[PDB]
Enzyme design. Structure first.
Site, mmCIF file in Angstrom:
data_model
loop_
_atom_site.group_PDB
_atom_site.id
_atom_site.type_symbol
_atom_site.label_atom_id
_atom_site.label_comp_id
_atom_site.label_asym_id
_atom_site.label_seq_id
_atom_site.Cartn_x
_atom_site.Cartn_y
_atom_site.Cartn_z
ATOM 1 N N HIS A 106 2.382 -7.046 23.393
ATOM 2 C CA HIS A 106 2.433 -6.473 24.736
ATOM 3 C C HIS A 106 2.794 -7.505 25.797
ATOM 4 O O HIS A 106 3.009 -7.163 26.952
ATOM 5 C CB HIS A 106 1.130 -5.717 25.085
ATOM 6 C CG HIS A 106 -0.030 -6.600 25.441
ATOM 7 N ND1 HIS A 106 -1.122 -6.767 24.610
ATOM 8 C CD2 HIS A 106 -0.306 -7.308 26.562
ATOM 9 C CE1 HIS A 106 -2.009 -7.541 25.203
ATOM 10 N NE2 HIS A 106 -1.545 -7.885 26.381
ATOM 11 N N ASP A 114 -0.452 -5.337 17.520
ATOM 12 C CA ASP A 114 -0.175 -6.106 18.725
ATOM 13 C C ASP A 114 -0.042 -7.607 18.423
ATOM 14 O O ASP A 114 -0.959 -8.390 18.682
ATOM 15 C CB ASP A 114 -1.291 -5.849 19.749
ATOM 16 C CG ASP A 114 -0.955 -6.356 21.141
ATOM 17 O OD1 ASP A 114 0.214 -6.705 21.403
ATOM 18 O OD2 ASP A 114 -1.872 -6.395 21.989
ATOM 19 N N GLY A 138 -4.996 -11.265 31.981
ATOM 20 C CA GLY A 138 -4.492 -12.618 32.087
ATOM 21 C C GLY A 138 -4.799 -13.439 30.855
ATOM 22 O O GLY A 138 -4.181 -14.480 30.630
ATOM 23 N N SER A 159 -4.622 -12.077 27.862
ATOM 24 C CA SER A 159 -3.755 -11.480 26.850
ATOM 25 C C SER A 159 -2.966 -12.479 26.022
ATOM 26 O O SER A 159 -2.428 -13.442 26.569
ATOM 27 C CB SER A 159 -2.767 -10.524 27.517
ATOM 28 O OG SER A 159 -3.380 -9.301 27.899
ATOM 29 N N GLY A 160 -2.901 -12.238 24.712
ATOM 30 C CA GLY A 160 -2.151 -13.114 23.838
ATOM 31 C C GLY A 160 -2.873 -14.382 23.433
ATOM 32 O O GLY A 160 -2.457 -15.058 22.488
#
Ligand SMILES: N=C(N)NCCCNC(=O)[C@@H]1CCCCN1C(=O)[C@@H](CC1CCCCC1)NCC(=O)O
Ligand SMILES: [Ca+2]
Length: 223
Positions: free
Chosen positions: A40, A84, A175, A177-178
Site C-alpha cells: 500500500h 500487503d 506514517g 506503514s511499511g
C-alpha cells in the site's frame, strides 16, 4: 508510534524511510540492494533513505539511494490489504556499516506471546496529530489469532497477525506503514493496517512475512 519511546540514533540500523519529497512510509533493508515494505506504500519516484534518525536534519550517517524498480506482490488486494508486501531494489548497493545494516528473514513463523520491536516516524497521538522527527520504538507481543479475529471479524486472513495491547495505549499509527516488526532478531511483520491507533480492542495488523520468504528469495534472485 503511540505510547512508544525514542529508539536512539541508529539503534535500528535496518529501518529505512521511503521519501517522495517527504517521508511517506518506512521499510526494511534485507541486503545491500533490496528493501521490503508494504504494498500500500507503492508509489512512483521513490528515494530510499538509510542511516536515518531525525528525518528533517542531515546528521551525517545517511545514504540516499533511488529505487530502480518496485515489485508489489502478485496477489495484493487493495480492498482488503491481504498480501500487503512489496520489494524495492536500490539503483546502487548501500554501504553496510554499524549504522546501516540488513535484517534477517525468518526461518519459521513466531508464536503468540513472542515480544517484537516495532519502529517508525508515524503519528504519536491516538486522538490527534503530532509527527515526531526522530525514530520511535515500541515493544509489543504477537497476539493470539483468536484475539485478532475477534477484533476484526471476517477481515483477518492467514497472511496477517495482530500485535499490540487489547487495552489500547500503545500501537503503530499513520506514517509507520511499511515499517518492520522484528521478533527474536528476524523480520516477522510489516506495519499494515488497523482501526485508528492505540484504541481498546483494536490492535495493529501486520503482514505475516514468514509466509513470503520463498517468494522474496525467488524474486530478488531473478531481478
Ligand atoms: N493502526 C495501526 N495499528 N497501525 C497503523 C497502520 C497504518 N496503515 C494504514 O493506515 C492503512 C494504509 C492503507 C489504507 C488503509 N489504512 C488503514 O489502516 C485502514 C484499514 C482498512 C483499509 C482497507 C482494508 C481493510 C482495513 N484504516 C485506517 C483506520 O481505520 O484508521
Ligand atoms: Ca537525517
Amino acid at each position: 508510534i503511540v505510547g512508544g519511546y525514542t529508539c536512539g540514533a541508529n539503534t535500528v540500523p535496518y529501518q529505512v524511510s521511503l521519501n517522495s519529497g517527504y517521508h511517506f512510509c518506512g521499510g526494511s533493508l534485507i541486503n545491500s540492494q533490496w528493501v521490503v515494505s508494504a504494498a500500500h506504500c507503492y508509489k512512483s519516484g521513490i528515494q530510499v533513505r538509510l542511516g536515518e534518525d531525525n528525518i528533517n536534519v542531515v546528521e551525517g550517517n545517511e545514504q540516499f539511494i533511488s529505487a530502480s524498480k518496485s515489485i508489489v506482490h502478485p496477489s495484493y488486494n487493495s480492498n482488503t490489504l491481504n498480501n500487503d508486501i512489496m520489494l524495492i531494489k536500490l539503483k546502487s548497493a548501500a554501504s553496510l556499516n554499524s549504522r546501516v545494516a540488513s535484517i534477517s528473514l525468518p526461518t519459521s513463523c513466531a508464536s503468540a506471546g513472542t515480544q517484537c520491536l516495532i519502529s517508525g516516524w508515524g503519528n504519536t497521538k491516538s486522538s490527534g496529530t503530532s509527527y515526531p522527527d526522530v525514530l520511535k520504538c515500541l515493544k509489543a507481543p504477537i497476539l493470539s489469532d483468536s484475539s485478532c479475529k475477534s477484533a476484526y471479524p471476517g477481515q483477518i486472513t492467514s497472511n496477517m497477525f495482530c500485535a499490540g495491547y487489547l487495552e489500547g495505549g500503545k500501537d503503530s499509527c499513520q506514517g509507520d506503514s511499511g515499517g518492520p516488526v522484528v521478533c527474536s532478531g528476524k523480520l516477522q511483520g510489516i506495519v499494515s493496517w488497523g482501526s485508528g491507533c492505540a484504541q481498546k480492542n483494536k490492535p495493529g495488523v501486520y503482514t505475516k512475512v514468514c509466509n513470503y520468504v520463498s517468494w522474496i528469495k525467488q524474486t530478488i534472485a531473478s531481478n
